[PDB]
Amino acid sequence: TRQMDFIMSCVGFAVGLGNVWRFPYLCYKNGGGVFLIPYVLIALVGGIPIFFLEISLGQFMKAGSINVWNICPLFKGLGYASMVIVFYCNTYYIMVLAWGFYYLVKSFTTTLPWATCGHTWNTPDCVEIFRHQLADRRSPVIEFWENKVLRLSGGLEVPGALNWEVTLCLLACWVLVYFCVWKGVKSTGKIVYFTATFPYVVLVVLLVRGVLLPGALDGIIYYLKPDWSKLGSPQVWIDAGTQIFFSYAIGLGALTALGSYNRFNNNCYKDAIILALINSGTSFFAGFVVFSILGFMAAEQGVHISKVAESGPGLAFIAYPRAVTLMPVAPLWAALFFFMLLLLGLDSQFVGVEGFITGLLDLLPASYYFRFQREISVALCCALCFVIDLSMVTDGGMYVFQLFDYYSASGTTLLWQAFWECVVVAWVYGADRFMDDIACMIGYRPCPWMKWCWSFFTPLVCMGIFIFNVVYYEPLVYNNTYVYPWWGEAMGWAFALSSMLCVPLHLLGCLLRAKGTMAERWQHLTQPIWGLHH
Ligand SMILES: [Cl-]
């Protein structure tokens, strides 16, 4: 009967800010068309196989967080790594909401703030209507993004003064997150439909408008037709692989929990394929929506598409709000779009904080148990994350955000986590045995492509990307202007290492704390710990 409900659950987990904001920004940063080829290749070879692996593993083990790795306890540190990654997400992901929140609070006006060059934050280069020195001029959307919301400083060396307008919005977002996490709201219980169809509808509307703009065809062509000389650069491969591993929540421990929630005999293969296709399609649709507006902007200003908008994380706050200035009733559509953005970000933040706090409290001993341990733990986590984000709501804040975006919960971190997960499942545990278990779970034997991806294809893809980036290293640059100094990249590597060291350190600690020679230690510490069902 109501099979559609299940579908909504899928989209209720699939669409997020990694599709509407990160995918377009990454695509524009690496060039439109050339980014899709590694995207498709990694989605087929690394994305979907790891998606199915994680979902099936969670379903088979019937447990999420760190316990899922009881198939190979020696590598349980993998779970710890995930618990770190999600934490870092909760640190900087909320930042997007704050900026979005700001826009929403500025949306309810008679005329939109980012449509006039007669404000105080604007520069003398602000020109409302473009005509035929001609490069220094900046559109009012860019002025609002880089003069009021961000107040961008010279570089990461100059943090500057705290931005109170965005600080209060960030505090409001964190208080709302705490209130809903403490209440344990049944978000997307039955009204899932709206929370699962409000984005697409709005996006569909945007797409229609995005198509009816002169010069949008050039933007779409730039989005689709690739430049083949950019395939040799390993940066596009990092961006595509990590974007897939980010939008799919691969390595963050989300797919494992989702699998653990399902029934034992549920068709996890179909669920994984459907979820991956939904997520990729949403990313592609957001790509159309952004790039049509980008082509319109490039035609209007007369500059190239690659230089019209910011290659920094502000595309969702430059490409999307600009589109709103074209709709018949701009403030209404601004409020609607940023309300949808806020709802998506809040759902993702709620589930992330729920999972992180639940796992952290699980690992804590019974002696540490406070009276209101849930309330106090959520409050402490939110306060600590707000204190950390105080570094992102300063003038030199976006730079820090970039450091949290490229290096933390992305980049080589996700490659490391995915590679180790594939090695543990396929090699140490046994890919053949896991395939047999999935066959006995869901009935039919999956395609052998899954086994070949777990065993040799995906681990070698991750290792090859990692090696081609370590050998050919390019310092992180923000929006083609700010080349990061040595200490900024050192801090980024500090985040990456704080995430990636969980696996080797856990393995060494487990081996050292065991007894006997290394052979029997390895044999005993990798023995799976089966649950009651198995
Ligand atoms: Cl995606």
Numbering used by the authors: 56 to 187, 202 to 603
Authors' text:
Creatine is obtained by the diet or synthesized by endogenous enzymes, and specifically transported into the cell using the creatine transporter (CRT), a sodium- and chloride-dependent transporter, belonging to the solute carrier 6 (SLC6) family. Impaired function of CRT leads to intracellular creatine deficiency, resulting in X-linked creatine transporter deficiency (CTD), a disorder characterized by intellectual disability, speech and language delay, behavioral abnormalities, and seizures. We determined the cryo-EM structures of CRT in the apo (CRT-apo), and in the presence of substrate creatine (CRT–creatine) or inhibitor RGX (CRT–RGX), at the resolutions of 3.29 Å, 3.40 Å, and 3.39 Å, respectively.
In the structure of CRT-apo, TM1 and TM6 form a translocation pathway accessible exclusively from the cytoplasmic side, suggesting that CRT-apo is in the inward-open state. Notably, in the CRT-apo, a distinct density has been identified as a putative Cl– ion, with no additional densities observed for Na+ ions. The conformational changes primarily involved the displacement of TM1a, a phenomenon also observed in GAT1 and GlyT1 during the transition from inward-occluded to inward-open state. Meanwhile, the Cl− ion remains in its conserved position and is not released.
